[PDB]
Write a protein that binds this DNA or RNA. Structure first.
Length: 45
DNA sequence: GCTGGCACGACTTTTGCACTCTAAATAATAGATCATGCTGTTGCACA
Protein backbone atom coordinates (compact mmCIF):
# COMPACT_ATOMS: atom_id res chain seq x y z
CA UNK A 1 0.00 0.00 0.00
CA UNK A 2 1.28 3.41 1.03
CA UNK A 3 1.68 6.04 -1.58
CA UNK A 4 4.40 4.81 -3.83
CA UNK A 5 1.34 3.05 -5.26
CA UNK A 6 -0.43 6.04 -6.74
CA UNK A 7 2.70 6.25 -8.88
CA UNK A 8 2.47 2.52 -9.63
CA UNK A 9 -1.17 2.79 -10.71
CA UNK A 10 -0.52 5.80 -12.95
CA UNK A 11 2.61 4.22 -14.42
CA UNK A 12 0.47 1.17 -15.34
CA UNK A 13 3.11 -1.23 -14.03
CA UNK A 14 2.28 -4.92 -14.24
CA UNK A 15 2.24 -6.95 -11.01
CA UNK A 16 4.57 -9.86 -10.30
CA UNK A 17 1.77 -12.48 -10.30
CA UNK A 18 -0.98 -11.34 -12.68
CA UNK A 19 -4.30 -13.16 -12.79
CA UNK A 20 -4.92 -14.89 -16.12
CA UNK A 21 -8.35 -14.38 -17.67
CA UNK A 22 -10.29 -16.19 -20.38
CA UNK A 23 -12.51 -15.57 -23.41
CA UNK A 24 -16.21 -15.79 -24.27
CA UNK A 25 -16.49 -19.59 -23.85
CA UNK A 26 -13.88 -21.11 -21.55
CA UNK A 27 -14.72 -24.79 -21.93
CA UNK A 28 -12.77 -27.20 -19.74
CA UNK A 29 -9.79 -28.72 -21.53
CA UNK A 30 -7.07 -29.10 -18.84
CA UNK A 31 -3.87 -29.88 -20.74
CA UNK A 32 -3.01 -30.26 -24.43
CA UNK A 33 0.55 -31.35 -25.28
CA UNK A 34 1.88 -29.51 -22.23
CA UNK A 35 5.20 -31.41 -22.01
CA UNK A 36 8.18 -29.44 -20.72
CA UNK A 37 6.99 -25.97 -21.71
CA UNK A 38 4.78 -24.66 -18.90
CA UNK A 39 1.90 -27.03 -18.08
CA UNK A 40 -1.86 -27.48 -18.43
CA UNK A 41 -2.36 -26.09 -21.95
CA UNK A 42 -6.04 -25.14 -21.82
CA UNK A 43 -7.90 -25.41 -25.15
CA UNK A 44 -11.41 -23.98 -24.78
CA UNK A 45 -13.12 -24.82 -28.08
C1' DG B 1 66.51 89.32 -33.11
C1' DC B 2 64.12 85.54 -30.24
C1' DT B 3 60.90 81.56 -30.13
C1' DG B 4 57.66 77.57 -31.32
C1' DG B 5 55.33 74.02 -33.91
C1' DC B 6 55.97 71.34 -39.09
C1' DA B 7 58.94 67.58 -42.57
C1' DC B 8 63.12 64.35 -43.87
C1' DG B 9 66.90 60.38 -43.92
C1' DA B 10 68.55 56.98 -41.50
C1' DC B 11 67.55 53.45 -37.79
C1' DT B 12 64.10 50.61 -35.08
C1' DT B 13 60.06 48.12 -34.27
C1' DT B 14 56.14 45.24 -35.77
C1' DT B 15 54.14 41.42 -38.50
C1' DG B 16 52.32 37.49 -41.34
C1' DC B 17 54.76 33.12 -43.27
C1' DA B 18 56.45 29.71 -40.99
C1' DC B 19 57.47 25.09 -39.61
C1' DT B 20 58.26 23.15 -34.12
C1' DC B 21 59.07 19.05 -30.48
C1' DT B 22 55.46 8.13 -17.47
C1' DA B 23 54.49 4.94 -13.30
C1' DA B 24 51.07 6.88 -10.39
C1' DA B 25 47.54 7.31 -8.51
C1' DT B 26 42.96 7.88 -7.61
C1' DA B 27 38.18 6.19 -6.51
C1' DA B 28 35.59 2.66 -5.28
C1' DT B 29 31.93 1.30 -0.61
C1' DA B 30 26.70 3.10 0.36
C1' DG B 31 20.19 4.78 -4.20
C1' DA B 32 17.38 2.47 -5.87
C1' DT B 33 14.31 1.75 -9.50
C1' DC B 34 12.66 0.81 -13.97
C1' DA B 35 12.90 -0.04 -19.18
C1' DT B 36 15.18 -2.09 -23.14
C1' DG B 37 18.27 -4.59 -26.04
C1' DC B 38 21.89 -8.42 -26.72
C1' DT B 39 23.41 -13.09 -25.93
C1' DG B 40 23.44 -17.73 -24.35
C1' DT B 41 20.16 -21.72 -22.91
C1' DT B 42 16.37 -24.76 -23.60
C1' DG B 43 11.67 -26.74 -25.11
C1' DC B 44 9.31 -28.05 -29.43
C1' DA B 45 8.40 -29.95 -33.94
C1' DC B 46 10.43 -32.04 -38.47
C1' DA B 47 13.15 -35.26 -42.26
Amino acid sequence: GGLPRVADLFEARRPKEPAILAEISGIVSFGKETKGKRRLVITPV
